[PDB]
Amino acid sequence: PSVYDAAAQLTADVKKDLRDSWKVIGSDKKGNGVALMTTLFADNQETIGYFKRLGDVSQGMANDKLRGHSITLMYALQNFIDQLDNPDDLVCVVEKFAVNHITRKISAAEFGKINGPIKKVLASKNFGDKYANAWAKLVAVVQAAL
Amino acid sequence: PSVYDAAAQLTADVKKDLRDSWKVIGSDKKGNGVALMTTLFADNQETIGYFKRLGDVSQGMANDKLRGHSITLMYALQNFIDQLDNPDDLVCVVEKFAVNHITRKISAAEFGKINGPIKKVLASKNFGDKYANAWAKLVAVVQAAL
Ligand code: HEM
Ligand code: HEM
Ligand SMILES: [Xe]
Ligand SMILES: [Xe]
Ligand SMILES: [Xe]
Ligand SMILES: [Xe]
Ligand SMILES: [Xe]
Ligand SMILES: [Xe]
Numbered sequence: 001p002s003v004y005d006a007a008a009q010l011t012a013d014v015k016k017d018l019r020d021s022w023k024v025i026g027s028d029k030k031g032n033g034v035a036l037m038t039t040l041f042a043d044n045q046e047t048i049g050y051f052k053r054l055g056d057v058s059q060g061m062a063n064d065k066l067r068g069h070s071i072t073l074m075y076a077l078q079n080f081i082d083q084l085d086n087p088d089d090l091v092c093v094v095e096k097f098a099v100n101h102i103t104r105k106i107s108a109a110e111f112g113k114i115n116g117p118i119k120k121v122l123a124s125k126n127f128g129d130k131y132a133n134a135w136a137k138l139v140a141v142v143q144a145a146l
Numbered sequence: 147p148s149v150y151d152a153a154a155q156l157t158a159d160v161k162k163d164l165r166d167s168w169k170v171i172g173s174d175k176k177g178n179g180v181a182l183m184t185t186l187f188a189d190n191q192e193t194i195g196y197f198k199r200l201g202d203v204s205q206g207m208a209n210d211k212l213r214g215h216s217i218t219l220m221y222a223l224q225n226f227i228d229q230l231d232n233p234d235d236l237v238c239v240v241e242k243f244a245v246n247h248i249t250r251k252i253s254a255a256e257f258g259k260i261n262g263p264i265k266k267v268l269a270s271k272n273f274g275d276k277y278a279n280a281w282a283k284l285v286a287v288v289q290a291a292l
Binding site for chain 1: 176199234
């Protein structure tokens with residue numbers, strides 16, 4: 001299937017759940033972005049080496065490169081959320097970020113490692129399994145490009 | 147380097163002018179982002195070669211990679227606007243994007259070529275030299291990091 005095919009999973013209900021949870025998670029991009037990355041590295045230690053540009057990714061907010069990365073990642077998510085109703089626009093921004101990951105040899109399966117950290121960050125604001133599942137559908141749009 | 151000294155130029159008055167103009171420009175990220183890029187390419191044709199990944203940029207909005215790029219650029223600007231309160235956070239996201247441009251061999255002087263396009267896009271929405279000059283101070287923070 002194509003990336004457009006994958007975006008068919010973003011039904012009205014999935015988009016509502018994405019938007020509702022993002023209103024909260026995206027309101028603290030620094031805090032929740034660094035939490036997302038820290039959780040990735042806590043649970044998926046095999047990924048740490050890919051991030052060597054950032055320095056020591058265990059230093060949390062006392063690592064300016066990690067903070068800058070993490071905030072910017074949250075604006076990638078903001079971008080996706082704002083494009084949900086126009087699959088043409090969603091696909092072209094997904095393809096852009098997919099290239100950022102392809103050129104670093106991140107496979108679709110490796111990209112999907114982010115679902116565990118997303119589930120945990122969601123649950124930190126009491127967004128449960130329905131919301132984690134909705135976010136996995138959005139992650140899968142990127143996986144379709146990888 | 148002199149990056150923190152550039153960031154210190156974003157006074158309360160400058161920040162207000164950035165926020166007030168961004169309220170309008172950032173309300174159409176697709177349209178104004180592509181306009182910024184097509185204006186850069188038209189007026190600074192010697193920069194087009196750097197963008198070869200995007201294909202034929204003369205196609206404008208109809209070029210999916212250019213559209214994806216352009217939307218994403220506007221979320222870099224959104225990020226900067228949202229960090230204006232906190233010099234450490236503004237600088238760490240500026241440094242992130244500066245690294246992206248250093249990889250592409252973009253100097254402070256060539257990055258500064260965006261000011262003419264910014265002035266033109268602002269003016270098209272009835273934001274004149276006052277606002278162009280505020281945006282130039284923000285551009286100068288990135289220039290200081292290159
Ligand atoms: C929600 C999921 C994710 C989003 C939206 C995302 C977004 C981003 C963004 C915006 C960048 C910056 C690209 C650049 O400027 O070149 C980035 C860099 C990167 N991403 Fe992700 N990413 C995600 C998940 C992952 C996962 C799960 C991995 C690996 C297992 C990964 C590995 C990388 C690497 C290695 C970099 C480069 C870091 C650096 O050296 O600057 N990403 N990602
Ligand atoms: C307001 C000013 C600008 C902002 C906020 C900005 C932002 C961005 C962003 C967010 C990206 C994607 C980075 C990545 O994923 O690696 C990018 C890419 C790029 N930028 Fe800029 N940029 C600006 C001006 C310029 C100018 C003036 C030049 C050149 C003279 C330039 C040259 C490039 C190049 C060559 C790329 C890579 C395109 C590609 O192959 O994907 N940028 N820029
Ligand atoms: Xe991504
Ligand atoms: Xe999220
Ligand atoms: Xe995602
Ligand atoms: Xe930038
Ligand atoms: Xe702008
Ligand atoms: Xe900028």
